[PDB]
């Protein structure tokens, strides 16, 4: 229950993050696979124990004390743009009751289906405006995760223009 609930974003390995939790864009199977999710597995092995989950859910394996939130986004190449919307939507929603039942004041977030499951297309806003509308309802601190200064230079672009 953080004092005064912000959004930030920064542009580095979220294996590295210094909040109280981690999102892993996962795959629906547990595997270790690549991006975010192999950072993830090389930091934190253990919280791939049963991690498999289905599409637009979010399951939270405990490394120790810190928690890891696997939150599936939909593969855009194989869902229609409606129902991978639809998708992408609900697994930000099950990343916030996550965050809510972990009673965390923090967590690292990077921006589900925006890699190799964006179906190559720029999904940034799509992606970004579906994590502020799970987590507007949150007290948590965010903190976005991403690799790219041009990415970095749009989100905070998009987070100043709600302050
Ligand atoms: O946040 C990001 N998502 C991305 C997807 C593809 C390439 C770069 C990035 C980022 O920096
Ligand atoms: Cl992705």
């Given at each position: 229950?953080?004092?005064?609930?912000?959004?930030?974003?920064?542009?580095m390995?979220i294996?590295?993050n210094?909040?109280?939790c981690?999102?892993?864009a996962?795959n629906?199977?547990?595997?270790?696979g690549?991006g975010v999710?192999?950072?993830?597995?090389?930091?934190?092995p253990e919280?791939?124990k049963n991690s498999?989950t289905?599409?637009?859910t979010?399951?939270?394996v405990?490394?120790?004390?810190?928690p890891v939130?696997?939150?599936?986004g939909?593969?855009?190449?194989?869902?229609?743009?409606?129902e991978?919307?639809?998708?992408?939507?609900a697994?930000?929603?099950?990343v916030a009751?996550?965050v809510?039942?972990?009673?965390?004041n923090?967590?690292?977030?990077?921006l589900?289906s925006?890699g190799?499951?964006?179906?190559?297309?720029?999904?940034?806003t799509?992606?970004?405006?579906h994590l502020?509308?799970?987590?507007?309802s949150?007290?948590a601190?965010?903190?976005?995760?991403?690799?790219?200064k041009?990415?970095?230079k749009?989100?905070?672009?998009?987070?100043?223009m709600?302050?």
């Open positions: 229950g953080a004092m005064a609930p912000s959004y930030r974003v920064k542009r390995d294996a590295k210094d909040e109280e981690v999102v892993n996962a629906p199977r547990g595997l270790p690549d999710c192999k950072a993830v597995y090389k930091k934190w919280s791939f498999a289905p599409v637009g979010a399951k939270t405990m490394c120790g004390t810190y939130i696997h939150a599936v939909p593969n855009f190449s194989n869902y229609t743009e409606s991978g919307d639809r998708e992408l939507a697994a930000y929603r099950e009751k996550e809510t039942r972990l009673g965390v923090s967590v690292a977030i990077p589900l925006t190799v499951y964006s179906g190559g297309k720029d999904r940034l799509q992606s970004l405006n502020f509308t799970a987590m507007d949150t007290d601190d965010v903190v976005i995760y991403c690799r790219d041009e990415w970095e749009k989100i905070s672009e998009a987070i100043q709600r302050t």
